[PDB]
PDB file of C-alpha atoms in Angstrom:
ATOM      1  CA  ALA A   1     -21.084 -37.905  -7.203  1.00  0.00           C
ATOM      2  CA  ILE A   2     -23.755 -36.227  -8.696  1.00  0.00           C
ATOM      3  CA  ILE A   3     -21.884 -32.951  -8.019  1.00  0.00           C
ATOM      4  CA  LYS A   4     -17.903 -33.325  -9.129  1.00  0.00           C
ATOM      5  CA  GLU A   5     -15.322 -30.907  -8.375  1.00  0.00           C
ATOM      6  CA  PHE A   6     -15.379 -29.492 -11.243  1.00  0.00           C
ATOM      7  CA  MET A   7     -18.790 -28.450 -13.254  1.00  0.00           C
ATOM      8  CA  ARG A   8     -19.874 -27.206 -16.396  1.00  0.00           C
ATOM      9  CA  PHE A   9     -23.431 -24.908 -16.690  1.00  0.00           C
ATOM     10  CA  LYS A  10     -25.105 -23.377 -20.120  1.00  0.00           C
ATOM     11  CA  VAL A  11     -28.040 -20.300 -18.862  1.00  0.00           C
ATOM     12  CA  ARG A  12     -30.487 -18.671 -20.128  1.00  0.00           C
ATOM     13  CA  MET A  13     -32.107 -15.629 -18.948  1.00  0.00           C
ATOM     14  CA  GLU A  14     -35.363 -13.856 -20.637  1.00  0.00           C
ATOM     15  CA  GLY A  15     -36.040 -10.350 -19.203  1.00  0.00           C
ATOM     16  CA  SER A  16     -37.306  -6.960 -19.068  1.00  0.00           C
ATOM     17  CA  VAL A  17     -35.783  -4.344 -17.735  1.00  0.00           C
ATOM     18  CA  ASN A  18     -38.113  -1.066 -17.255  1.00  0.00           C
ATOM     19  CA  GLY A  19     -40.194  -2.581 -19.945  1.00  0.00           C
ATOM     20  CA  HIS A  20     -36.786  -3.124 -22.503  1.00  0.00           C
ATOM     21  CA  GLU A  21     -36.757  -6.558 -23.314  1.00  0.00           C
ATOM     22  CA  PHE A  22     -34.426  -8.818 -23.875  1.00  0.00           C
ATOM     23  CA  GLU A  23     -32.252 -12.166 -24.040  1.00  0.00           C
ATOM     24  CA  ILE A  24     -29.203 -13.174 -22.882  1.00  0.00           C
ATOM     25  CA  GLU A  25     -27.153 -17.097 -23.341  1.00  0.00           C
ATOM     26  CA  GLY A  26     -24.258 -17.795 -21.220  1.00  0.00           C
ATOM     27  CA  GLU A  27     -21.780 -20.975 -19.921  1.00  0.00           C
ATOM     28  CA  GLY A  28     -19.843 -21.180 -16.729  1.00  0.00           C
ATOM     29  CA  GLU A  29     -17.631 -23.178 -15.303  1.00  0.00           C
ATOM     30  CA  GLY A  30     -15.992 -23.780 -11.888  1.00  0.00           C
ATOM     31  CA  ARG A  31     -15.386 -26.339  -8.453  1.00  0.00           C
ATOM     32  CA  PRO A  32     -18.126 -26.521  -6.240  1.00  0.00           C
ATOM     33  CA  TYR A  33     -16.583 -27.898  -3.649  1.00  0.00           C
ATOM     34  CA  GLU A  34     -14.865 -24.937  -3.679  1.00  0.00           C
ATOM     35  CA  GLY A  35     -16.577 -22.105  -4.203  1.00  0.00           C
ATOM     36  CA  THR A  36     -15.475 -20.402  -6.926  1.00  0.00           C
ATOM     37  CA  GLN A  37     -17.332 -19.737 -10.812  1.00  0.00           C
ATOM     38  CA  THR A  38     -16.763 -17.617 -14.240  1.00  0.00           C
ATOM     39  CA  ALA A  39     -19.378 -17.183 -16.632  1.00  0.00           C
ATOM     40  CA  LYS A  40     -19.143 -16.076 -19.854  1.00  0.00           C
ATOM     41  CA  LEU A  41     -22.488 -14.395 -21.121  1.00  0.00           C
ATOM     42  CA  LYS A  42     -23.669 -12.207 -24.951  1.00  0.00           C
ATOM     43  CA  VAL A  43     -26.949 -10.533 -24.603  1.00  0.00           C
ATOM     44  CA  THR A  44     -28.477 -12.352 -27.890  1.00  0.00           C
ATOM     45  CA  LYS A  45     -31.499 -10.447 -28.211  1.00  0.00           C
ATOM     46  CA  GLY A  46     -32.295  -6.267 -27.189  1.00  0.00           C
ATOM     47  CA  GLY A  47     -28.576  -5.767 -27.021  1.00  0.00           C
ATOM     48  CA  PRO A  48     -27.407  -3.222 -26.234  1.00  0.00           C
ATOM     49  CA  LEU A  49     -28.554  -2.698 -22.767  1.00  0.00           C
ATOM     50  CA  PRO A  50     -30.188   0.553 -21.878  1.00  0.00           C
ATOM     51  CA  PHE A  51     -29.465  -0.773 -18.109  1.00  0.00           C
ATOM     52  CA  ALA A  52     -26.636  -1.642 -15.568  1.00  0.00           C
ATOM     53  CA  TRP A  53     -25.196  -4.931 -16.555  1.00  0.00           C
ATOM     54  CA  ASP A  54     -24.961  -5.258 -12.555  1.00  0.00           C
ATOM     55  CA  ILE A  55     -28.313  -5.932 -11.560  1.00  0.00           C
ATOM     56  CA  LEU A  56     -28.545  -8.697 -13.550  1.00  0.00           C
ATOM     57  CA  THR A  57     -24.832 -10.504 -12.242  1.00  0.00           C
ATOM     58  CA  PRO A  58     -26.332 -11.982  -8.827  1.00  0.00           C
ATOM     59  CA  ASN A  59     -28.476 -13.753 -10.678  1.00  0.00           C
ATOM     60  CA  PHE A  60     -25.878 -15.475 -12.883  1.00  0.00           C
ATOM     61  CA  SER A  61     -25.077 -20.354  -9.082  1.00  0.00           C
ATOM     62  CA  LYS A  62     -25.883 -21.610  -5.832  1.00  0.00           C
ATOM     63  CA  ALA A  63     -24.188 -25.309  -6.346  1.00  0.00           C
ATOM     64  CA  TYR A  64     -20.827 -23.794  -6.279  1.00  0.00           C
ATOM     65  CA  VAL A  65     -20.911 -22.699  -2.450  1.00  0.00           C
ATOM     66  CA  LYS A  66     -18.166 -24.162  -0.494  1.00  0.00           C
ATOM     67  CA  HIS A  67     -19.710 -25.711   2.630  1.00  0.00           C
ATOM     68  CA  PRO A  68     -17.896 -27.102   5.616  1.00  0.00           C
ATOM     69  CA  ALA A  69     -18.787 -30.342   6.465  1.00  0.00           C
ATOM     70  CA  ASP A  70     -20.814 -29.747   9.532  1.00  0.00           C
ATOM     71  CA  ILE A  71     -23.564 -27.506   7.291  1.00  0.00           C
ATOM     72  CA  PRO A  72     -25.722 -29.206   5.003  1.00  0.00           C
ATOM     73  CA  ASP A  73     -25.561 -28.000   1.752  1.00  0.00           C
ATOM     74  CA  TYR A  74     -29.446 -28.725   0.535  1.00  0.00           C
ATOM     75  CA  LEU A  75     -28.788 -27.309  -2.694  1.00  0.00           C
ATOM     76  CA  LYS A  76     -26.210 -29.555  -4.139  1.00  0.00           C
ATOM     77  CA  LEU A  77     -28.184 -32.328  -2.041  1.00  0.00           C
ATOM     78  CA  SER A  78     -30.665 -31.085  -4.404  1.00  0.00           C
ATOM     79  CA  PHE A  79     -29.287 -32.927  -7.177  1.00  0.00           C
ATOM     80  CA  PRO A  80     -29.226 -34.632  -9.784  1.00  0.00           C
ATOM     81  CA  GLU A  81     -32.875 -32.802  -9.882  1.00  0.00           C
ATOM     82  CA  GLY A  82     -32.372 -29.823  -8.877  1.00  0.00           C
ATOM     83  CA  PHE A  83     -34.175 -27.025  -7.050  1.00  0.00           C
ATOM     84  CA  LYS A  84     -35.707 -23.630  -8.157  1.00  0.00           C
ATOM     85  CA  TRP A  85     -35.370 -20.164  -6.920  1.00  0.00           C
ATOM     86  CA  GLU A  86     -37.361 -17.008  -6.458  1.00  0.00           C
ATOM     87  CA  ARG A  87     -36.194 -13.561  -5.607  1.00  0.00           C
ATOM     88  CA  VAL A  88     -36.950 -10.429  -4.751  1.00  0.00           C
ATOM     89  CA  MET A  89     -34.021  -7.288  -4.807  1.00  0.00           C
ATOM     90  CA  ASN A  90     -35.713  -4.036  -3.720  1.00  0.00           C
ATOM     91  CA  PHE A  91     -33.904  -1.066  -4.436  1.00  0.00           C
ATOM     92  CA  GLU A  92     -33.263   1.977  -2.110  1.00  0.00           C
ATOM     93  CA  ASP A  93     -34.613   4.499  -5.415  1.00  0.00           C
ATOM     94  CA  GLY A  94     -37.619   1.924  -6.035  1.00  0.00           C
ATOM     95  CA  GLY A  95     -36.721   0.019  -8.621  1.00  0.00           C
ATOM     96  CA  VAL A  96     -38.069  -3.316  -8.555  1.00  0.00           C
ATOM     97  CA  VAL A  97     -36.126  -6.801  -9.661  1.00  0.00           C
ATOM     98  CA  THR A  98     -38.042 -10.031  -9.529  1.00  0.00           C
ATOM     99  CA  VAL A  99     -36.592 -13.681 -10.801  1.00  0.00           C
ATOM    100  CA  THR A 100     -38.046 -17.066 -11.642  1.00  0.00           C
ATOM    101  CA  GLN A 101     -34.906 -19.424 -11.918  1.00  0.00           C
ATOM    102  CA  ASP A 102     -34.739 -22.985 -12.060  1.00  0.00           C
ATOM    103  CA  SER A 103     -31.661 -25.383 -12.065  1.00  0.00           C
ATOM    104  CA  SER A 104     -31.130 -28.728 -13.225  1.00  0.00           C
ATOM    105  CA  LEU A 105     -29.032 -31.475 -13.885  1.00  0.00           C
ATOM    106  CA  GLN A 106     -28.569 -32.830 -17.723  1.00  0.00           C
ATOM    107  CA  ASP A 107     -25.800 -34.603 -19.186  1.00  0.00           C
ATOM    108  CA  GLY A 108     -23.000 -33.802 -16.362  1.00  0.00           C
ATOM    109  CA  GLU A 109     -23.750 -30.241 -16.548  1.00  0.00           C
ATOM    110  CA  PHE A 110     -26.102 -27.650 -15.384  1.00  0.00           C
ATOM    111  CA  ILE A 111     -28.996 -25.498 -17.142  1.00  0.00           C
ATOM    112  CA  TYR A 112     -30.043 -22.769 -15.482  1.00  0.00           C
ATOM    113  CA  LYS A 113     -33.243 -21.044 -17.413  1.00  0.00           C
ATOM    114  CA  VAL A 114     -33.699 -17.704 -15.346  1.00  0.00           C
ATOM    115  CA  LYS A 115     -36.364 -14.970 -15.748  1.00  0.00           C
ATOM    116  CA  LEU A 116     -36.195 -11.615 -14.627  1.00  0.00           C
ATOM    117  CA  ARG A 117     -38.619  -8.534 -14.597  1.00  0.00           C
ATOM    118  CA  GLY A 118     -37.272  -4.764 -13.787  1.00  0.00           C
ATOM    119  CA  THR A 119     -38.998  -1.999 -12.783  1.00  0.00           C
ATOM    120  CA  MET A 120     -40.086   1.183 -11.141  1.00  0.00           C
ATOM    121  CA  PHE A 121     -36.315   1.996 -12.001  1.00  0.00           C
ATOM    122  CA  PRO A 122     -35.898   6.153 -11.896  1.00  0.00           C
ATOM    123  CA  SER A 123     -35.086   6.805 -15.690  1.00  0.00           C
ATOM    124  CA  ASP A 124     -32.251   9.608 -14.158  1.00  0.00           C
ATOM    125  CA  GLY A 125     -31.329   6.387 -12.015  1.00  0.00           C
ATOM    126  CA  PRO A 126     -28.075   5.114 -11.632  1.00  0.00           C
ATOM    127  CA  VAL A 127     -29.092   1.581 -13.380  1.00  0.00           C
ATOM    128  CA  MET A 128     -31.067   3.373 -16.231  1.00  0.00           C
ATOM    129  CA  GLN A 129     -27.919   5.748 -16.476  1.00  0.00           C
ATOM    130  CA  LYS A 130     -25.480   3.318 -16.284  1.00  0.00           C
ATOM    131  CA  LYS A 131     -23.683   4.994 -13.693  1.00  0.00           C
ATOM    132  CA  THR A 132     -22.454   1.904 -11.742  1.00  0.00           C
ATOM    133  CA  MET A 133     -19.672  -0.081 -11.027  1.00  0.00           C
ATOM    134  CA  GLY A 134     -19.798  -3.507  -9.418  1.00  0.00           C
ATOM    135  CA  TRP A 135     -21.180  -4.688  -6.302  1.00  0.00           C
ATOM    136  CA  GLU A 136     -18.958  -4.808  -2.742  1.00  0.00           C
ATOM    137  CA  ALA A 137     -18.884  -8.016  -1.341  1.00  0.00           C
ATOM    138  CA  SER A 138     -22.094  -9.226   0.587  1.00  0.00           C
ATOM    139  CA  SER A 139     -22.872 -11.662   2.682  1.00  0.00           C
ATOM    140  CA  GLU A 140     -26.506 -13.356   2.723  1.00  0.00           C
ATOM    141  CA  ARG A 141     -27.795 -14.661   5.690  1.00  0.00           C
ATOM    142  CA  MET A 142     -29.370 -18.036   5.641  1.00  0.00           C
ATOM    143  CA  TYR A 143     -32.175 -19.532   7.723  1.00  0.00           C
ATOM    144  CA  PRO A 144     -34.652 -22.438   6.959  1.00  0.00           C
ATOM    145  CA  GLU A 145     -38.259 -21.797   6.674  1.00  0.00           C
ATOM    146  CA  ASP A 146     -41.537 -23.529   5.000  1.00  0.00           C
ATOM    147  CA  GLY A 147     -39.566 -26.134   3.836  1.00  0.00           C
ATOM    148  CA  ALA A 148     -37.100 -24.217   2.225  1.00  0.00           C
ATOM    149  CA  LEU A 149     -33.978 -22.035   1.951  1.00  0.00           C
ATOM    150  CA  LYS A 150     -34.263 -18.494   2.764  1.00  0.00           C
ATOM    151  CA  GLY A 151     -31.379 -15.956   2.492  1.00  0.00           C
ATOM    152  CA  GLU A 152     -31.527 -12.247   3.121  1.00  0.00           C
ATOM    153  CA  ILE A 153     -28.806  -9.425   2.157  1.00  0.00           C
ATOM    154  CA  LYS A 154     -28.445  -6.109   2.260  1.00  0.00           C
ATOM    155  CA  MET A 155     -26.513  -5.831  -1.240  1.00  0.00           C
ATOM    156  CA  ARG A 156     -24.168  -2.471  -2.388  1.00  0.00           C
ATOM    157  CA  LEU A 157     -23.516  -1.550  -5.476  1.00  0.00           C
ATOM    158  CA  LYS A 158     -20.375   1.108  -5.571  1.00  0.00           C
ATOM    159  CA  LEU A 159     -21.136   3.962  -7.925  1.00  0.00           C
ATOM    160  CA  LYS A 160     -19.200   5.433 -10.740  1.00  0.00           C
ATOM    161  CA  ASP A 161     -19.124   8.772  -8.944  1.00  0.00           C
ATOM    162  CA  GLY A 162     -18.068   7.312  -5.371  1.00  0.00           C
ATOM    163  CA  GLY A 163     -21.097   6.815  -3.828  1.00  0.00           C
ATOM    164  CA  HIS A 164     -23.359   3.722  -3.264  1.00  0.00           C
ATOM    165  CA  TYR A 165     -26.435   2.159  -4.335  1.00  0.00           C
ATOM    166  CA  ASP A 166     -28.243  -0.244  -1.927  1.00  0.00           C
ATOM    167  CA  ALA A 167     -30.543  -3.434  -2.519  1.00  0.00           C
ATOM    168  CA  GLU A 168     -32.951  -5.112  -0.180  1.00  0.00           C
ATOM    169  CA  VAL A 169     -32.720  -9.138  -1.323  1.00  0.00           C
ATOM    170  CA  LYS A 170     -34.724 -11.936  -0.386  1.00  0.00           C
ATOM    171  CA  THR A 171     -34.974 -15.116  -1.942  1.00  0.00           C
ATOM    172  CA  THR A 172     -36.446 -18.628  -1.474  1.00  0.00           C
ATOM    173  CA  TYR A 173     -34.280 -21.455  -2.698  1.00  0.00           C
ATOM    174  CA  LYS A 174     -36.467 -24.630  -2.554  1.00  0.00           C
ATOM    175  CA  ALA A 175     -35.200 -28.143  -4.520  1.00  0.00           C
ATOM    176  CA  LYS A 176     -37.581 -29.995  -6.080  1.00  0.00           C
ATOM    177  CA  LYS A 177     -37.687 -33.347  -3.853  1.00  0.00           C
ATOM    178  CA  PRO A 178     -37.142 -32.920   0.136  1.00  0.00           C
ATOM    179  CA  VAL A 179     -33.665 -33.092   0.821  1.00  0.00           C
ATOM    180  CA  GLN A 180     -31.551 -31.920   4.689  1.00  0.00           C
ATOM    181  CA  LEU A 181     -31.761 -28.094   5.364  1.00  0.00           C
ATOM    182  CA  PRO A 182     -29.197 -26.687   7.447  1.00  0.00           C
ATOM    183  CA  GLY A 183     -29.984 -24.452  10.388  1.00  0.00           C
ATOM    184  CA  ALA A 184     -28.821 -20.318   9.844  1.00  0.00           C
ATOM    185  CA  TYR A 185     -25.689 -19.731   8.511  1.00  0.00           C
ATOM    186  CA  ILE A 186     -24.004 -17.170   6.787  1.00  0.00           C
ATOM    187  CA  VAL A 187     -22.486 -16.813   3.200  1.00  0.00           C
ATOM    188  CA  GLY A 188     -19.883 -14.629   1.837  1.00  0.00           C
ATOM    189  CA  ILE A 189     -20.196 -13.607  -1.568  1.00  0.00           C
ATOM    190  CA  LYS A 190     -18.205 -11.627  -3.897  1.00  0.00           C
ATOM    191  CA  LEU A 191     -18.777 -11.208  -7.539  1.00  0.00           C
ATOM    192  CA  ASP A 192     -17.141  -9.056 -10.114  1.00  0.00           C
ATOM    193  CA  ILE A 193     -17.683  -8.598 -14.194  1.00  0.00           C
ATOM    194  CA  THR A 194     -13.451  -9.312 -15.248  1.00  0.00           C
ATOM    195  CA  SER A 195     -13.802  -8.696 -18.476  1.00  0.00           C
ATOM    196  CA  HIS A 196     -16.150  -6.567 -20.861  1.00  0.00           C
ATOM    197  CA  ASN A 197     -16.843  -5.482 -24.311  1.00  0.00           C
ATOM    198  CA  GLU A 198     -16.982  -1.891 -25.147  1.00  0.00           C
ATOM    199  CA  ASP A 199     -20.468  -2.000 -25.780  1.00  0.00           C
ATOM    200  CA  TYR A 200     -20.956  -4.295 -23.327  1.00  0.00           C
ATOM    201  CA  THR A 201     -22.709  -6.940 -25.382  1.00  0.00           C
ATOM    202  CA  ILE A 202     -20.984  -9.891 -23.850  1.00  0.00           C
ATOM    203  CA  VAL A 203     -19.144 -10.099 -20.016  1.00  0.00           C
ATOM    204  CA  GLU A 204     -17.539 -12.297 -18.129  1.00  0.00           C
ATOM    205  CA  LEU A 205     -17.984 -12.593 -14.507  1.00  0.00           C
ATOM    206  CA  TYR A 206     -16.398 -14.495 -11.634  1.00  0.00           C
ATOM    207  CA  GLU A 207     -17.579 -14.979  -8.110  1.00  0.00           C
ATOM    208  CA  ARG A 208     -16.716 -17.078  -5.188  1.00  0.00           C
ATOM    209  CA  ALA A 209     -19.320 -18.081  -2.479  1.00  0.00           C
ATOM    210  CA  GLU A 210     -18.056 -19.908   1.066  1.00  0.00           C
ATOM    211  CA  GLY A 211     -20.469 -20.940   3.859  1.00  0.00           C
ATOM    212  CA  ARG A 212     -19.426 -20.280   7.568  1.00  0.00           C
ATOM    213  CA  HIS A 213     -21.027 -19.861  10.919  1.00  0.00           C
ATOM    214  CA  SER A 214     -23.152 -17.116  11.610  1.00  0.00           C
ATOM    215  CA  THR A 215     -21.490 -15.909  15.348  1.00  0.00           C
ATOM    216  CA  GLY A 216     -24.999 -14.571  15.838  1.00  0.00           C
ATOM    217  CA  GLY A 217     -25.854 -11.277  13.957  1.00  0.00           C
ATOM    218  CA  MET A 218     -28.305 -12.201  10.739  1.00  0.00           C
ATOM    219  CA  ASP A 219     -29.547  -8.507  10.964  1.00  0.00           C
ATOM    220  CA  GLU A 220     -27.308  -5.822  12.197  1.00  0.00           C
ATOM    221  CA  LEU A 221     -24.664  -7.629  13.947  1.00  0.00           C
ATOM    222  CA  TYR A 222     -23.447  -9.931  11.285  1.00  0.00           C
TER     223      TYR A 222
END
């Protein structure tokens, strides 16, 4: 076993949102075959952030998705070399977040390097005004294409003032070496910030993710 039942990770993210530069370092741990994990993140530069942490969170670990035996776990199979991923999050108000990530394994621990760029968020919008309250549970609709794994999500962020703020998210996940890709399927995910400090320079997350067969819906009917 390359991927153990209990695994830790270290993550570094360099990014900017609307021109505001920042850096974040974190450490996480979880149970890859169980689809549960946690992370503790510290802003190491550019704090306190002048925008909602919520836009950053889905950006802090695909090896930790519980998969049934009949769905190839492409991303776990990618180790020890690992994989890379590139994502686009197009928010309903024109904000855009692009992400580039590299996942590797070293000395028994995963190493994540993330580069993020957020742009065009309205200055008076919920992101810049920090008016968000956590993501609703998501369903990432997965399918193989061009020798990589593709995922689509309509993510919905809760607004402090009872509404929601949506984003159309598309990601491409690619193993460094060819390994078995799965067929189309769906991953149910729930991410929460479980703790944070007064000025939000330290936050803790918890995420649960499990793959299952689609019952047909992949777009509007999932």
